[PDB]
Design a protein around this ligand. Structure first.
Ligand SMILES: CCCCCC/C=C/CCCCCCCCCC(=O)O[C@@H](COC(=O)CCCCCCCCCCCCCCC)COP(=O)(O)OC[C@H](O)CO
Ligand SMILES: CCCCCC/C=C/CCCCCCCCCC(=O)O[C@H](COC(=O)CCCCCCCCCCCCCCC)COP(=O)(O)OC[C@H](O)CO
Ligand SMILES: CCCCCC/C=C\CCCCCCCCCC(=O)O[C@@H](COC(=O)CCCCCCCCCCCCCCC)COP(=O)(O)OC[C@H](O)CO
Ligand SMILES: CCCCCC/C=C\CCCCCCCCCC(=O)O[C@H](COC(=O)CCCCCCCCCCCCCCC)COP(=O)(O)OC[C@H](O)CO
Ligand SMILES: CCCCCCCCCCCCCCCCCC(=O)O[C@@H](COC(=O)CCCCCCCCCCCCCCC)COP(=O)(O)OCCN
Ligand SMILES: CCCCCCCCCCCCCCCCCC(=O)O[C@@H](COC(=O)CCCCCCCCCCCCCCC)COP(=O)(O)OCCN
Ligand SMILES: CCCCCCCCCCCCCCCCCC(=O)O[C@@H](COC(=O)CCCCCCCCCCCCCCC)COP(=O)(O)OCCN
Ligand SMILES: CCCCCCCCCCCCCCCCCC(=O)O[C@@H](COC(=O)CCCCCCCCCCCCCCC)COP(=O)(O)OCCN
Ligand SMILES: CCCCCCCCCCCCCCCCCC(=O)O[C@@H](COC(=O)CCCCCCCCCCCCCCC)COP(=O)(O)OCCN
Ligand SMILES: CCCCCCCCCCCCCCCCCC(=O)O[C@@H](COC(=O)CCCCCCCCCCCCCCC)COP(=O)(O)OCCN
Ligand SMILES: CCCCCCCCCCCCCCCCCC(=O)O[C@@H](COC(=O)CCCCCCCCCCCCCCC)COP(=O)(O)OCCN
Ligand SMILES: CCCCCCCCCCCCCCCCCC(=O)O[C@H](COC(=O)CCCCCCCCCCCCCCC)COP(=O)(O)OCCN
Lengths: 98, 435, 110, 116, 100, 63
RNA sequence: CGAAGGUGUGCUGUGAGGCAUGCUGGAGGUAUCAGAAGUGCGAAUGCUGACAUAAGUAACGAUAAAGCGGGUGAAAAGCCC
């Protein structure tokens, strides 16, 4: 079947896939072993937040290709004819009757 | 555009229903917690700006098991919808529900392809929704007519998406691609970042508001210039017209023959650039050892483990992928040969084979218009003006997506306002086959 | 009326077309024109096209009724005689006329 | 004429003056262990191209000029200007959207995530 | 010199299209419309001095034109000559041949 | 036309017409005849310009 | 606000003809009196063009017979296979 179609799936998948694979690891890593509660203050926030934590990465377009073409020149059935005059009358007759 | 041709009787009283009942489509995604409410059209946490921090990678929009990003779940549902519309029409006269039935067949295949794509939409929510109630996202309470959790978590997330999906394959009577993508544009734009439009820090360029708004208007502009073909045949010059008379005198002038011609090169993807730059810098750095991304905040450049090496490799590949692939098995140009027997007399007829090694090398060497389209719209948030560590100084997937509907408005109206098509000059020519 | 159709300037023996004009005159449409499509001569299937065109003009465009349409008058008038030669014999040639007709159908109301 | 060659003119002006200046920029003229060998490398590459001039290496022009030059030619032929006027009604719309949105998303968030 | 510019005025159009003129450039030879010069020697020396093409046997053939059978007076297309110039080196990819 | 002819000089003009004909018209007329650079206005010029130079030579031995 | 011409009609003069008028026609035409003509046609085995007549008649060009099945096409005894 079409191979272009196969690529189309591959590209879309690939761009998303690299982000997702990376993302699960991605956090900021480090395996810190917890200073525990020895008073101090805990927790953090940011100003606003970018939604709740669920995967959204999004894509796609079209089957592609564009075309333009020209059309002109059609349709004639037309005549044109000629003729000319003539003359001819041969001999080969002897008119006597015996 | 939005159209109606919905199943059951009438189609002009389905138009009446359509606008009113679009309120109902918005309502059930937003509210009613029985088939879920989260993550399809409804944000559960107010306002906008990054929620993952402490990485260069997190500037792009990052993540941390699944990701902090605005709604439109997974990646699987919408992407496969247009692909299997294309795939079944071209490859399969057998085990397909159309053989291509015209405009009627465009809407027909979309219905069936929705079922074929529903299975794909399942898959991601299996992983997401077992992790989800142990972190943000948990609704307010789901009553649950079920008594399970195994299918129950999966179902709630999918259904919200499904409502939007159904209507989206209904509008596809006039059946072109870049349809799916528009529905998908809306969700990401609506949530992502105008609260401060470009984060300020009292620096060279980040010091004023509404900077981002200016940038978007050029990005559409490129896509609308894109549809222009490339043209130029042998073509000669126009010298003659002719009149109707019963004796003739002169006919023929301009004639256009297609070997195929450039159909545009960069076509199809709509978020492509942003992810390419991102991956090989990251994987070397800190899924390995090393460091290197975008850094600094000045016009000292940086931007050195990404940008133009992203282009060469990927760019070249994708554009040739268009030309080459299809050419081997099932291609526009097949179309040209049929449609131009009526061409005959002057530009050539039977020869050896029409075109040869000429068309081959042509599409190959080219590559330049593939560079132009791909680089110009994406370079804009990649460099911007500096190298700052606030958003839009590498990555720009947000501004790639939006452009698609914007283009539509002038193009689509011209086709709509008449029962259009073109051509009429033949009836199938009589065959003289010899030699 | 405005529902008519006619033909002009085509080669054909005009006398033979004349015979089948009379045959179907005043006998309405598609109930005596079915004769033509099942009988001798190519003159039959030549006037048939002129008939079903007048009918199609009393249907589409002007009018809308073809069961209230009768082929009132149908005839055919002598067309051009397009001069040509046959080299007859003995260096003497004699003119062949290429007979032509102007088929005239005039449908009106039934 | 200009269809049989292009690149040569712009090379010469830069070559005569630029090379010396390139070392200086951003306050370096000093050995960090030596440097100044940078002048030799800059000169050396220009030599190579110049002495191989006939159809000169990199892209070349024996037969390879016809390849690139005539897939460039039809593509840039078409009129940019005609498109441009039509386009600029879609452009102005786009701008509006990307400031608009924030209010609507915030509104729906409040009245969800709470159910009795 | 060996010849003037008016003995290098000998080409006004090639032939590079359709049967036995695309086929007989790919498979063999090269073919071009050679005005109406009526020489073979100066056409060999044309592709020496201009271009840099090397040739084998140069073949000359008169083309008597072809009918335009709708009259007015005489009609018909004008005379010209076709020549199979024949490559021995060059291997040109159309609209290349040499020029320094 | 006017000033063109008048500023011509024997030694000069001789070598200028060689350029005109060959590799400014030679290329042009071949390209144009195959539709690969067919621009009709360029054909009209060059042709009716190279002519001029030769005129002066047989008239008065250049300007 | 309808000429000449064409085509119907009425009237009138011994006649050659004239006048009026409807219609068609879409522009020019001309009282009166005098002068001057390539000045009036049915025939010349007249001349030229057109269209008849015989007649839907003779003939359809070799007595080296063709038949069938698919194909194309609006239609195949004749073409292609
Ligand atoms: C979003 C939409 C998708 C986009 C991406 C993919 C696009 C692909 C491009 C085009 C579509 C191609 C459709 C091909 C359909 C037919 C497949 C086929 O033919 O599969 C065969 C192999 O099956 C088997 O491996 C059965 C066991 C299979 C095990 C799993 C491996 C599957 C491999 C699939 C390869 C697909 C790509 C290549 C397609 C040519 C069937 O068995 P056979 O005995 O060989 O049949 C012989 C005769 O044909 C029928 O008697
Ligand atoms: C021919 C095509 C060229 C394309 C690229 C052109 C890039 C132009 C650069 C900048 C735009 C103009 C800037 C105007 C002056 C601004 C102030 C200034 O001069 O800034 C400097 C810019 O240096 C810098 O670009 C240092 C880095 C300069 C690198 C230049 C590299 C050129 C490479 C060309 C390679 C061949 C390309 C051939 C293409 C055909 C220093 O950087 P700042 O961050 O300010 O550091 C802070 C200051 O020390 C104190 O304030
Ligand atoms: C040309 C050779 C053949 C012909 C001449 C032969 C001459 C005789 C041969 C040899 C001479 C004896 C051996 C000399 C060895 C010199 C080694 C040397 O001195 O190498 C220096 C770097 O040279 C550098 O070209 C550093 C380069 C940095 C990257 C440059 C990237 C390209 C820039 C553009 C180049 C030109 C492009 C345009 C060309 C037309 C070492 O740099 P340091 O001072 O340590 O500072 C480095 C750090 O900043 C601090 O550690
Ligand atoms: C001393 C050395 C100094 C070096 C630095 C110099 C810097 C300034 C110089 C140059 C900058 C560009 C100025 C000219 C812009 C012209 C745009 C234009 O006019 O573009 C036209 C096309 O439209 C198009 O691109 C439509 C789009 C045109 C506008 C694009 C505007 C983009 C602006 C981006 C700005 C970003 C700033 C940072 C934001 C954070 C050009 O058409 P033509 O080729 O004429 O037509 C050809 C004919 O059809 C066929 O023959
Ligand atoms: C998630 C994405 C899934 C889809 C990926 C793309 C799918 C492309 C579609 C089809 C690929 C080929 C299927 C088998 C074809 C068998 C028949 C055939 O023609 O085989 C040819 C050999 O196969 C090919 O040529 C296939 C070429 C394209 C392959 C593209 C890669 C597919 C796999 C990609 C996996 C991911 C790679 C990731 C890398 C980082 C024969 O060689 P030939 O064409 O030269 O003809 C010889 C006789 N004259
Ligand atoms: C019945 C047939 C139909 C249903 C089939 C369902 C099952 C198969 C379907 C899909 C495969 C899903 C992925 C399986 C491999 C990866 C997950 C894994 O290895 O999980 C283990 C490891 O899990 C982890 O380390 C957490 C992260 C898991 C996801 C990792 C995704 C990596 C994606 C890489 C993409 C690379 C792309 C490269 C090209 C750009 C679980 O360990 P555990 O048993 O101790 O459970 C711990 C639970 N917290
Ligand atoms: C968007 C505006 C608001 C719309 C409101 C709709 C109200 C009902 C009106 C119309 C019915 C739905 C029309 C669209 C159907 C699209 C899918 C389709 O074509 O379905 C089948 C055809 O459907 C029809 O012809 C129309 C529906 C048949 C009759 C249904 C009767 C029961 C209706 C119950 C409505 C309950 C509403 C309750 C609201 C609270 C064919 O299926 P297939 O061949 O593609 O695939 C086979 C299955 N995999
Ligand atoms: C981007 C964000 C993250 C996304 C998600 C990332 C991926 C998910 C993360 C982590 C989870 C990874 C899961 C990996 C696959 C786990 C598969 C599993 O659990 O398999 C077990 C599943 O076990 C079962 O389900 C038990 C069997 C149930 C059978 C039910 C049907 C029986 C019907 C029989 C009918 C009669 C016979 C019919 C014969 C045809 C069996 O494993 P094992 O014991 O063989 O392995 C031992 C060595 N480690
Ligand atoms: C063959 C490597 C290909 C790398 C391609 C991406 C390059 C991006 C460019 C710049 C950003 C990354 C800079 C990395 C600097 C590395 C500095 C270094 O050598 O770090 C350590 C070594 O780092 C590495 O070896 C790099 C990481 C290796 C694992 C990941 C390999 C990814 C290969 C990707 C191939 C596909 C690329 C596709 C590009 C289109 C030093 O060793 P160590 O002290 O950690 O002790 C040894 C290890 N325990
Ligand atoms: C997109 C597809 C293609 C992917 C693969 C592309 C590969 C391109 C190859 C080379 C370009 C490398 C660009 C990245 C350079 C990263 C430099 C960097 O990260 O520098 C940091 C140090 O990183 C390292 O040491 C590891 C990475 C080194 C990469 C190679 C740098 C070469 C620089 C010139 C060396 C000249 C040696 C002269 C010897 C006398 C600086 O650390 P800092 O704390 O001072 O600054 C803040 C954090 N950036
Ligand atoms: C991008 C690859 C695409 C491949 C596509 C498939 C294969 C097709 C086959 C061949 C095409 C190969 C790509 C050609 C792209 C176009 C190149 C081009 O047009 O170059 C022009 C310009 O060429 C140049 O400017 C060449 C310059 C070479 C010297 C560079 C000096 C500066 C170096 C800076 C430092 C770099 C240091 C890197 C290492 C640290 C040619 O000029 P022209 O019109 O006059 O043509 C006749 C040339 N004799
Ligand atoms: C089985 C009885 C309970 C559920 C009845 C259906 C409720 C439909 C309402 C809303 C859909 C969203 C909530 C679904 C909750 C989870 C249901 C579930 O997981 O059912 C499973 C059984 O599901 C199946 O057997 C079928 C699964 C595939 C089809 C699911 C279709 C759901 C929607 C049907 C709508 C029909 C009417 C539409 C027009 C008004 C497991 O059974 P259980 O919940 O009773 O737990 C006991 C075992 N641990």
């Amino acid at each position: 079947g079409t191979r272009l179609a196969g690529i189309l799936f591959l590209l879309t998948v690939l761009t998303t896939v690299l982000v997702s694979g990376w993302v699960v690891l991605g956090w900021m890593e480090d395996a810190q072993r917890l200073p525990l509660s020895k008073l101090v203050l805990t927790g953090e926030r940011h100003y606003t937040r970018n939604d709740d934590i669920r995967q959204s990465i999004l894509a796609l377009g079209e089957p592609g290709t564009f075309m333009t073409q020209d059309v002109n020149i059609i349709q004639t059935q037309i005549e044109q004819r000629l003729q000319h005059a003539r003359l001819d009358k041969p001999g080969a007759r002897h008119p006597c009757w015996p | 555009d939005f159209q109606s041709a919905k199943g059951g009787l009438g189609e002009l009283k389905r138009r009446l229903l359509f606008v009113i009942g679009a309120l109902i489509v918005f309502r059930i995604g937003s509210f009613i917690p029985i088939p879920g409410i989260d993550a399809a059209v409804l944000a559960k946490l107010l306002e906008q700006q990054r929620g993952t921090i402490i990485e260069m990678f997190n500037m792009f929009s990052g993540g941390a098991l699944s990701r902090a990003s605005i709604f439109a779940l997974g990646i699987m549902p919408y992407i496969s919808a247009s692909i299997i519309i294309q795939l079944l029409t071209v490859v399969h006269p057998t085990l397909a529900e159309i053989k291509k039935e015209g405009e009627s067949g465009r809407r027909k295949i979309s219905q069936y392809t929705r079922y074929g794509t529903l299975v794909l939409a399942i898959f991601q929510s299996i992983g997401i929704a077992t992790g989800l109630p142990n972190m943000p996202g948990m609704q307010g309470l789901v009553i649950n007519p079920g008594f399970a959790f195994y299918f129950t978590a999966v179902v709630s997330l999918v259904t919200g998406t499904m409502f939007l999906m159904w209507l989206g394959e209904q509008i596809t009577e006039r059946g072109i691609g870049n349809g799916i993508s528009i529905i998908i544009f809306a969700g990401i734009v609506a949530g992502l970042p105008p609260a401060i439009a470009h984060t300020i820090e009292q620096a060279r360029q980040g010091d004023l508001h509404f900077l981002v708004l200016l940038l978007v208007a050029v990005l559409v502009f490129a896509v609308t210039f894109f549809v222009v073909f490339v043209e130029r045949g042998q073509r000669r010059i126009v010298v003659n017209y002719a009149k109707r008379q019963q004796g003739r005198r002169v006919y023929a002038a301009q004639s256009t023959h297609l070997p195929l011609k450039v159909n545009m090169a960069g076509v199809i993807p709509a978020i492509f650039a942003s992810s390419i730059i991102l991956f090989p810098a990251t994987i070397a750095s800190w899924f390995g050892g090393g460091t290197g991304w975008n850094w600094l905040t000045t016009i000292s450049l940086y931007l050195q483990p990404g940008q133009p090496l992203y282009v060469l490799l990927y760019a070249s590949a994708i554009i040739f992928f268009c030309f080459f692939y299809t050419a081997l098995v099932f291609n526009p140009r097949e179309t040209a040969d049929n449609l131009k027997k009526s061409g005959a007399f002057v530009p050539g007829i039977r020869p050896g084979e029409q075109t040869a090694k000429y068309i081959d090398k042509v599409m190959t060497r080219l590559t330049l218009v593939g560079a132009l389209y791909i680089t110009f719209i994406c370079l804009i948030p990649e460099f911007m003006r500096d190298a700052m560590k606030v958003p839009f100084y590498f990555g720009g997937t947000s501004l790639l997506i939006v452009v698609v509907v914007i283009m539509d408005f002038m193009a689509q109206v011209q086709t709509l306002m008449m029962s259009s098509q073109y051509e009429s000059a033949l009836k199938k020519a009589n065959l003289k086959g010899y030699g | 009326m405005e529902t008519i159709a006619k033909h002009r300037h085509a080669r054909s023996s005009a006398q033979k077309v004349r015979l089948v004009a009379d045959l179907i005159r005043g006998k309405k449409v598609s109930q005596a024109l079915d004769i033509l499509t099942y009988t001798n001569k190519k003159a039959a299937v030549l006037v048939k096209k002129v008939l079903e065109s007048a009918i199609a003009n009393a249907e589409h465009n002007d009018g809308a009724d073809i069961d209230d349409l009768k082929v009132t008058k149908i005839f055919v008038d002598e067309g051009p005689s397009m001069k040509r030669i046959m080299p007859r014999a003995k260096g003497r040639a004699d003119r062949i006329l290429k007979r032509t007709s102007h088929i005239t159908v005039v449908v009106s109301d039934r | 004429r200009g269809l049989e060659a292009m690149k040569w003119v712009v090379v010469v002006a830069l070559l005569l003056v630029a090379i010396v200046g390139n070392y200086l920029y951003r306050d370096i003229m000093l050995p960090l262990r030596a440097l100044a060998v940078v002048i030799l490398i800059a000169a050396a590459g220009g030599v190579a191209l110049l002495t191989t001039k006939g159809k000169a290496t990199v892209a070349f022009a024996r037969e390879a000029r016809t390849e690139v030059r005539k897939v460039i030619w039809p593509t840039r032929q078409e009129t940019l200007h005609t498109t441009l006027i039509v386009a600029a009604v879609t452009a102005v719309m786009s701008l509006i959207l990307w400031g608009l949105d924030g209010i609507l998303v915030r509104l729906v968030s409040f009245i969800t995530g709470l159910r009795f | 010199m060996i010849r003037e510019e008016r003995l290098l005025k000998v080409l006004r159009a090639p032939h590079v299209s359709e049967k036995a003129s695309t086929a007989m450039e790919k498979s063999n030879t090269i073919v071009l419309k050679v005005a109406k010069d009526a020489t073979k020697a100066e056409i060999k020396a044309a592709v020496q001095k201009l271009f840099e093409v090397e040739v084998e046997v140069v073949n000359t053939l008169v083309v008597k034109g072809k009918v335009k059978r709708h009259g007015q007076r005489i009609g018909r297309r004008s005379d010209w000559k076709k020549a199979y110039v024949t490559l021995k080196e060059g291997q040109n990819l159309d609209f290349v041949g040499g020029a320094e | 036309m006017k000033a063109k002819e008048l500023r011509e000089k024997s030694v000069e003009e001789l070598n200028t017409e060689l350029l005109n004909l060959l590799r400014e018209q030679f290329n042009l007329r071949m390209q144009a005849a195959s539709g690969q650079l067919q621009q009709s206005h360029l054909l009209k010029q060059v042709r009716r310009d190279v002519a001029r130079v030769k005129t002066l030579l047989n008239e008065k031995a250049g300007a």
